[PDB]
């Protein structure tokens with residue numbers, strides 16, 4: 079069962095929103111840890127629930143591994159407004175962030191260390207690979223597979239039944255319309271001055 | 273008043289989400305019907321509430337007509353999280369799907385057999401033509417008319433006051449900025465590898 | 467404390483949605499005022515709460531100033547479904563519209579006369595300049611500054627840490643990927659017939 083206190087590793091902007099979600103869940107105190115300011119992580123800290131509040135997928139993973147290896151429990155932070163199908167699977171105690179108004183539909187699967195950011199949507203039967211980040215307003219249509227460590231930018235989307243290779247980036251505003259077997263950076267067209 | 277059981281016609285991915293909405297509404301049992309697997313529709317089935325859980329607009333319509341002609345009631349499945357203005361009009365018992373976190377604002381009109389998919393928005397004074405599908409995250413601005421049988425792809429949008437011809441497709445991620453008097457397939461720019 | 471009645475200045479489409487929000491907040495009666503139909507504003511009206519229900523930023527501002535100078539209180543209309551971080555700052559009694567399912571995250575700041583339209587998202591640490599309009603589904607990523615009087619079209623978005631100059635327009639569906647020090651109209655690529 080959840081501890082009264084939680085360690086939040088990452089004390090900048092992402093830490094701010096993780097703290098709001100932790101408070102929404104009923105945590106009474108959030109204690110920030112950070113390598114570059116304020117209080118540091120030490121292997122020797124009391125066993126409170128942990129969360130890794132770092133947006134960068136590669137760094138969140140590295141820090142996640144260090145925390146796990148030190149025997150700490152890395153909880154999921156899931157906003158109460160998130161709507162999760164009873165047949166959806168969200169990996170338990172796996173440092174998953176689920177932000178306000180996220181929807182996860184039937185049989186979708188969420189792997190460890192994932193960020194589902196504000197108002198993102200994961201449609202039925204999706205598979206969202208570990209340490210991926212689905213940003214604000216980003217949406218996966220039915221039966222989409224997102225590879226491990228992927229980043230989907232703000233307001234990006236993936237059409238139904240598509241697969242995105244591990245370690246790929248889908249740019250903010252971009253629409254993925256075909257399978258990508260090989261990793262890459264897939265971008266849309268930026269706003270242009272008239 | 274709603275029956276305890278509901279027949280859901282279409283036993284694949286769309287059927288999965290329709291079942292979640294039916295359960296959210298308080299249905300106790302969903303019975304899948306499908307022409308190509310499991311239990312079949314027969315004219316002779318007991319009169320439970322029906323829903324047509326088929327995404328394809330043309331097929332949903334054909335099946336809708338068959339079910340109506342056999343004297344069955346095709347209900348609307350409306351998630352409790354949908355926000356519908358008191359002056360909005362949603363055709364009663366007309367096989368309309370309204371998914372989680374859909375918003376329908378003042379005086380908007382929703383015709384029969386429509387799908388309003390996850391987190392779509394129908395702004396004030398819109399008219400959404402029968403058997404249209406507004407996909408996940410797709411949004412119609414104020415006073416938009418969507419013709420009969422249209423498909424609006426994931427994260428597509430229509431600017432205020434525009435009209436889209438019957439039997440048109442607006443691609444995933446695409447932005448309709450002008451009236452379309454003649455049907456067509458209107459597409460945006462797909463993500464491109466850098 | 468809120469009056470039982472509210473004057474809504476602007477009796478067209480935007481007035482319709484402002485009225486729904488006012489009713490959601492518990493107002494018992496909305497009285498429409500408009501320069502070009504129905505009942506007019508007069509300096510001499512009883513002091514009910516006011517709201518300026520005009521979408522155009524320039525006109526909303528002009529009318530806002532007239533109403534303020536006549537000693538009326540211009541309230542915020544905030545839908546109950548809006549999720550606002552406890553560390554977010556929304557200017558009090560400042561004619562701000564916050565529509566259904568808007569999310570405002572940690573430390574974001576909302577200035578006077580702003581419209582946050584249906585399902586828009588304002589991420590952590592954003593600054594949204596006075597009399598701006600963030601339309602339906604438009605989203606600002608972390609630490610974005612939107613200048614005074616800006617318009618962000620339906621389903622547009624701004625990438626993290628960017629700044630948009632005062633009096634700018636970001637078109638419907640458009641993705642702002644760089645800082646804009648000088649005002650302009652920044653547009654995406656419209657849907658094209660195949």
Ligand SMILES: CC(=O)N[C@H]1[C@@H](OP(=O)(O)OP(=O)(O)OC[C@H]2O[C@@H](n3ccc(=O)[nH]c3=O)[C@H](O)[C@@H]2O)O[C@H](C)[C@@H](N)[C@@H]1O
Nearest residue numbers: 088089090091092093112113114131132133134137608626
């Ligand atoms: C500024 C920016 O673009 N922030 C974005 C970023 O937020 P972060 O808080 O992850 O990014 P940051 O502002 O670079 O801060 C990272 C924090 O992690 C810390 N840190 C780092 C490495 C380490 O090995 N140990 C450690 O502790 C580092 O010291 C810093 O406080 O990702 C979010 C998902 C976005 N919403 C947000 O807009």
Ligand SMILES: CC(=O)N[C@H]1[C@@H](OP(=O)(O)OP(=O)(O)OC[C@H]2O[C@@H](n3ccc(=O)[nH]c3=O)[C@H](O)[C@@H]2O)O[C@H](C)[C@@H](N)[C@@H]1O
Nearest residue numbers: 220238282283284285286287306307308325326327328331
């Ligand atoms: C795979 C895919 O892209 N699915 C998409 C599709 O889901 P469906 O379940 O409609 O599509 P399907 O996976 O082709 O299944 C259609 C079902 O209808 C059945 N059927 C068909 C014809 C008939 O005349 N009688 C009959 O019964 C057919 O046998 C099948 O089980 O539309 C949704 C809106 C999307 N979210 C979803 O991603």
Ligand SMILES: CC(=O)N[C@H]1[C@@H](OP(=O)(O)OP(=O)(O)OC[C@H]2O[C@@H](n3ccc(=O)[nH]c3=O)[C@H](O)[C@@H]2O)O[C@H](C)[C@@H](N)[C@@H]1O
Nearest residue numbers: 414432476477478479480481500501502519520521522525
């Ligand atoms: C038709 C349209 O595109 N409407 C859009 C517009 O709605 P409005 O209601 O603001 O626009 P309108 O339909 O032009 O009506 C403006 C109202 O303001 C009134 N008025 C005007 C000037 C004045 O100095 N005094 C005064 O009172 C004017 O008479 C009229 O009734 O902005 C919203 C944010 C959008 N959702 C909506 O789609």
